[PDB]
Design a protein around this ligand. Sequence first.
Ligand code: 8Q1
Ligand code: 8Q1
Ligand code: FES
Ligand code: FE2
Ligand code: FE2
Lengths: 74, 74, 125, 125, 402, 402, 118, 81, 81
Amino acid sequence: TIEERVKKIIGEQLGVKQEEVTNNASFVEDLGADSLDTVELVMALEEEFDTEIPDEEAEKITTVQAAIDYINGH
Amino acid sequence: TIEERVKKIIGEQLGVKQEEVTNNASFVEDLGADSLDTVELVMALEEEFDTEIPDEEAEKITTVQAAIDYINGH
Amino acid sequence: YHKKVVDHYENPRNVGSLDKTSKNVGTGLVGAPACGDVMKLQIQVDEKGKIVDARFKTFGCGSAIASSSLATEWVKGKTVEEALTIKNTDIAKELCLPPVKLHCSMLAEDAIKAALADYKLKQEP
Amino acid sequence: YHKKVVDHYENPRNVGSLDKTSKNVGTGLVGAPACGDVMKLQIQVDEKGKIVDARFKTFGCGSAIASSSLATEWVKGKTVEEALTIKNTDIAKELCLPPVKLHCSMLAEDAIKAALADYKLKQEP
Amino acid sequence: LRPLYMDVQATTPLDPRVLDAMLPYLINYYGNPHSRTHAYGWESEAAMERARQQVASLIGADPREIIFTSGATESNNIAIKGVARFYRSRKKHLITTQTEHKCVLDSCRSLEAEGFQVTYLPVQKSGIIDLKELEAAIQPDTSLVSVMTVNNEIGVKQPIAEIGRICSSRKVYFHTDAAQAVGKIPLDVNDMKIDLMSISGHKIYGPKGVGAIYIRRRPRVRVEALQSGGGQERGMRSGTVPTPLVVGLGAACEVAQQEMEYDHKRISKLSERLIQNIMKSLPDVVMNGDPKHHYPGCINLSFAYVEGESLLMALKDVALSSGSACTSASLEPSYVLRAIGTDEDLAHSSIRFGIGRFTTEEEVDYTVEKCIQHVKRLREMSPLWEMVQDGIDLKSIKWTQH
Amino acid sequence: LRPLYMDVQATTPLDPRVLDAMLPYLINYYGNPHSRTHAYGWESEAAMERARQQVASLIGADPREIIFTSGATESNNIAIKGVARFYRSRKKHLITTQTEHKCVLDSCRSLEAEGFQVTYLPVQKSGIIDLKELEAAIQPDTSLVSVMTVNNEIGVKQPIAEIGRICSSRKVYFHTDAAQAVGKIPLDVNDMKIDLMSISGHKIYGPKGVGAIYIRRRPRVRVEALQSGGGQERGMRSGTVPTPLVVGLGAACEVAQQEMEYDHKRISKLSERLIQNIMKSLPDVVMNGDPKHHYPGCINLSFAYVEGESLLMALKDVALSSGSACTSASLEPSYVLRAIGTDEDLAHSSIRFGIGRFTTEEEVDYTVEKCIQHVKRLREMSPLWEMVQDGIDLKSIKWTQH
Amino acid sequence: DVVNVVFVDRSGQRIPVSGRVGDNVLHLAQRHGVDLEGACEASLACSTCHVYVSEDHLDLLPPPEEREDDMLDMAPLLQENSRLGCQIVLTPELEGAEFTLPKITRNFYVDGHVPKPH
Amino acid sequence: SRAQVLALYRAMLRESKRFSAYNYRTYAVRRIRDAFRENKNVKDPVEIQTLVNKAKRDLGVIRRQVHIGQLYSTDKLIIEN
Amino acid sequence: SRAQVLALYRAMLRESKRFSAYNYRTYAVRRIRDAFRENKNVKDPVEIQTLVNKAKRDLGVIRRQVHIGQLYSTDKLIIEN
Ligand SMILES: *P(=O)(O)OCC(C)(C)[C@@H](O)C(=O)NCCC(=O)NCCSC(=O)CCCCCCCCCCC
Ligand SMILES: *P(=O)(O)OCC(C)(C)[C@@H](O)C(=O)NCCC(=O)NCCSC(=O)CCCCCCCCCCC
Ligand code: FES
Ligand SMILES: [Fe+2]
Ligand SMILES: [Fe+2]
């Protein structure tokens, strides 16, 4: 499952007890994360799902749904 | 002049008094040079005329005419 | 560390103890002079005069533990007279002990002699 | 090397010689005590008592050559009394000479004094 | 796979910043710094002076007070022997401690063979000297007092500032061996009243084969040089100064000055983690040295009824050190643990753990788990542990030696 | 643009093969070679022994006879002072030459300050000692004879094998300073009957801050250690052995053993070229030292009527060296040129050219051309040259000093 | 204004000297044929004017400056009563002062060479 | 400067994750994260500019050391398994 | 083996010409050209194989040192102008 692994890394990277990672929770407002944490979450996503997310696509990844959509599409 | 420069390096690389360099003189038989000298002559040609001669084309360069034809064509 | 010493250390033979009280068991507890190595070796001798079981417990370096383990299995199967012929040179030659570790083979031989002496001391009327 | 010393060594001023048999020319040839530096400074004095020309030739280190060149350019234009007031401290201060190179400024002053004394002796009845 | 490194007291890995600083002088700037006539020499000299200023800035000294050496062994030799020989005509007595490093102790012994008198001060159970004992031990003909800043084996910290105040009041030169302290705890030569100090490059993530000694200029301390030659390093250490090595030492000192507070916080956290996790799972484990005056990066623990070398052999995947006599090339028992009053069998049971700039929590946890398992196994093998379980006192045993 | 390097006698650039050999121990294998209990120490110890065998193979010795040091200065100090102090109870006399290096000479001077008698043998005008003079100078209480293999300033070669034969016949320990000879001319300790030998890493394209001393095992030579400590290096040099530096030294010795013949043939050709081209264009240029017993890589020329420092300043684009007192920090005249009988003004005019493994024919001819032009320019500036051109003898001048 | 001092040379010979107030010890020794090197001529660069001062007068000199102390670091056979002779000036308090020449200097003359007077 | 700081942080992390040696890799990652979080609330543009320049120098050092350590690489540690 | 030897010779020359330092570049070029011409008449295949293995090791050393010297490069010599 792709989105299961996406939620797992988001939970591991942000420390949200693997239960607040919904399909509409934002990284900055809902979850507790700043810009550096977002950078690291993007890099962790890149490491698990082997790829090279460009800057434009990385800036669009602000929610769990956005991350899931990018990983599934690519 | 392209072939003038080709003859100049051939003469410099082989030590032939800049007068033995002609359009049908071979590097091994007519001029005095071994395969190592031929390797170095090819590399010198590559340096002067900026290019990357492949192995197949380098093996075809046994005469001054062959060197001139390759340099002029490329 | 030589591979023989490493083998004996990581797979020691006959680690344990034997009931001190039993008539047919000798216990040898010895210590090294210029270091803290302490060896306890116990043997069991049957009615025929043959050593059927042996155990050890060693407080000491890896070479000491290897010497103790090697001395135990070497002791198993022999008689008292044969076991009295096990010198330290043989133990050290088998384990490839350097000069600084010769105290281990010396202490192992001392433990063997102490156990054998304890046994007949027990076998005296 | 300090840049002033380098400039004087790179572009020396008034290298050459003068007719030492002439009445109005004094020659000073001096040497350093603890090393091989040798200086020859010559000056030309006009009828008014003013120094109109100066030359030098130096066997020595770059600092010595710079000191001699600077001494020539400072000696041109002055009188004998004014030239008697140039000091090795001034030469060393201008060239920024480290302590080990103070022998150069000392030798340059000695050369100036020797040339002036030579001229005065030549101008004696 | 390679084992984990927890032996930072023995030596440290080279910091990548230090290597980056060194490489240009190993490739292009290879000139002799003592060549006075050309640009290779000039650039080498400039780099060497830059490194001197970096070291002086780290310890709060003037750059002219720093002399480069080949290591803290050479620095200790220079301090002790040079001071003692220079003031030989009036002063013939030296003071040091029983827990000093071997270079200091052997210099003092060879001076005793040279006619000097040496007092070896005892230490308390905590590993700290008694200021009353030092004050009573100072004689009118005392030349030098040598006390190390951080002990390399148990990590206790001596009261350097108090010792320096006492020495200054008594007009005695005070030397400290700071090889294990530089770049790890704050040091100020003027605040402490230090007259000489030894520094080692490879204890502070710098290169091996280089060191430095601090020698006070005001009021002037004199030493008699041990290495004869052309008069390099103000006449006190002849020979060619190894420009890449001294550049690396200077870069390491700058990095340490930048990183000390963060490093100390991290290491203190890691050290408490290691100590608490070991003690909460293993009975009969004691720390050697006093926690109140301890550098957390050097942890010396005794595992009762288990021999230290056997434990080390069991911990094949972790690089460590032990004070047991069976790890000595000459069966030397640990004189530091003897000096602090440790009983001999516990001294044979001591293990030294090192936590430095690059240690990870992952490594600490792995070491703790392996130690717990292997101490349990070796205690199941231990006759001393069996006898203790049976209530038979170990002191009362009549061991049959030979 | 950077100047050309022709100062190999002062120091050499690092060979890329040596750097390639060193780097793994500066990155990954950073353990202490004296750590007896883990794999980092074991691998460091193995690399050190490999390097020791490499050095011993280069000089024809058993590996057990090689002691690693911090350089040839330390090696010379160890040889001279250790031998003299160890045999102090019977032998009180030492022999060396007037042209030796400063470390050897200063060790002998400091020994003269602790009661020893030292004889400084004169040399002939060729720079070669007189064997009859040495044989007459040997006393029944003579301990040590020290003569360097290749002079660092004029490049003359002493008859080392003959000296060793004489010393063996007289039962006198023979030491040679081979810092400028190792890896450049053949050396065999047993054929030459050498008892002690000094080696320097950075003179043979190895790293700075490392060296070695050969000490003969059969019959045994003893020294008294100068550096007290833990007993490393068979008790003769305490301290941590710098594994990267000793690995580099071993690699450099192996490379020199493989490349010596080719290097000597090329260097000899280049040296002949430089000397002939200088002499065919400049009058009044003399070579210091005898060509018949000369190492071609060290060329010492005197340019009459031109001061050496001024010539060096004129050659701003070439790194060179001079014997002039004006290049000395204390105005020291050249004692080597004094010893071979060079008149002072010529000694003030001497230039040392170095030709090594990396010198090119391009560089040699550039140096020759610049030298010719600038010597002509400085002679046109020279009052001595003017006086000579006028027939006024320089010896007859009554110079007015002060 | 006459200061009477004594120079002790390497051989042990004692040389009485009748100096003056304001005199310089190096120049005063060289004027009287005492072989004190003094290469740099009181420029504080060579350290070869090194002398030993007698204990009864050492404390009567002005204390050395750190430039003098730095140059003394370079002098072989340094002692607690070591001074640079080129930095010492004669005062009436220095009556009877003795200056002993050290056996060697910073510059190497193991062949026995003696530099000409400066 | 926020975009420049984020880009520099990303570049530092990505290049530091390419360290061959475990100790250097873990240390560089931790240190960069701790330093950027430590200086999160700085206000003075001069101080921010200084920190940025220092970080560029550190990134250069990291690049060179990563490449050298890839040229000279050894086996992995026991805990990396 | 002739083609293999010629290819090895070409690779060694091509990479040695990329040395940043003048001394190393000139030395490596001259040394390779002298050694290959020196061993031009060897006949024992064992000796040829040994020489080829040595040359491969040397080529590896040259590659690493060229890259490191490009990472740490200085100005040119006065004669390269
Ligand atoms: P995000 O919500 O935008 O928040 C993050 C930032 C920093 C972008 C934001 O808070 C902000 O703009 N704050 C203003 C101050 C600022 O810019 N802070 C960061 C300054 S730059 C900095 O801290 C560099 C630190 C470099 C450390 C290098 C470590 C190298 C280690 C090498 C080991 C070998
Ligand atoms: P051409 O007519 O083909 O003739 C040339 C060859 C060599 C191809 C031909 O003569 C031949 O095959 N001869 C047989 C013997 C032979 O192969 N000789 C060469 C063997 S390989 C060799 O000599 C390798 C030398 C390596 C030198 C390394 C230099 C390293 C420098 C390092 C600087 C830091
Ligand atoms: S004369 Fe040179 S220091 Fe006194
Ligand atoms: Fe043991
Ligand atoms: Fe001069």
